[PDB]
Amino acid sequence: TGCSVTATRAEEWSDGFNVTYSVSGSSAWTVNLALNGSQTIQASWNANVTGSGSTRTVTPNGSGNTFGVTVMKNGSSTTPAATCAGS
């Protein structure tokens, strides 16, 4: 009982990068995304993620263990942090 979410860099440009976190081990998992600096969430897919501060609750739609969102670099091309928990 322990989801294993992972992070990775998919697309990228002089404005933001499409991060692609891959979850494997369980379907009912939750990956709390945490942008860095003033970064923000421009878009997402493969999972219902939302929020309004420095983190967004991500969730699997049923078969999209791996999600992907546009990290608004906003002066930061570093990948965000993501953690998961069994619940």
Side-chain angles (χ1 to χ4, degrees), residues 26-40:
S26 324
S27 354
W29 51 266
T30 298
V31 168
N32 231 103
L33 271 184
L35 279 306
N36 330 287
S38 90
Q39 278 184 8
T40 90

Side-chain angles (χ1 to χ4, degrees), residues 13-80:
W13 42 92
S14 197
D15 217 336
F17 49 107
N18 283 325
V19 158
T20 46
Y21 281 89
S22 313
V23 174
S24 309
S26 324
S27 354
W29 51 266
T30 298
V31 168
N32 231 103
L33 271 184
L35 279 306
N36 330 287
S38 90
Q39 278 184 8
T40 90
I41 288 307
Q42 170 117 290
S44 76
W45 50 85
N46 244 327
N48 278 215
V49 52
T50 31
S52 6
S54 273
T55 48
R56 301 247 206 194
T57 293
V58 172
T59 35
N61 44 83
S63 258
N65 287 67
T66 301
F67 72 73
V69 305
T70 288
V71 187
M72 270 260 110
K73 269 209 207 180
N74 286 2
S76 172
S77 83
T78 253
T79 288

